Design a protein that fits this description.
- This protein is mostly helical and 178 residues long.
- It is 46% helix and 3% strand.
- The N and C termini lie far apart (39 Å).
- Bound molecules: zinc ion (ZN) (3 copies).
- One zinc ion binds next to loops.
Amino acid sequence: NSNICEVCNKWGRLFCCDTCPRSFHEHCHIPSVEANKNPWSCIFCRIKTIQERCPESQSGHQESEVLMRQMLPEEQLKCEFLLLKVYCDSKSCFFASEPYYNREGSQGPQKPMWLNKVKTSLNEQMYTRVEGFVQDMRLIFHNHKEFYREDKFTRLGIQVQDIFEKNFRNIFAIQETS
Ligand SMILES: [Zn+2]
Ligand SMILES: [Zn+2]
Ligand SMILES: [Zn+2]
């Protein structure tokens, strides 16, 4: 196994996957590393199994159809994995915890949103369709763009949004386009 967490790239108290060489801090894995279960298989491995069981699941899809899917167990997992892929980028630090807004010339968003809030909402099964999860993820970055206006810090929102969107297209096998 690796000797650093796959998500935050730090050492510490790590749980090792039985079917691949990745390792995780307990609360870095999503869902949080399960208490018992020997063997244990990480989210990467679980996602690969879905693909392997249904190879056709990698054929192109329309985003509109994906968003209307109900949050059954496999879509729950996919959203968990997509959230984890965002936390994998160090720039997610800026969007992890609850923000506050006091900048001359700007007003805070009407509906603040942050990664840990999305993580809790997934854990508590609050989303009934993929659309709910995707809307809250895109809201994170849209709120940031609007608030930071012409400050160069706006770029951090563009950057992390691009990681989300690339991963969304990959995990949900969105049909490639020009
Ligand atoms: Zn970690
Ligand atoms: Zn694994
Ligand atoms: Zn099949």
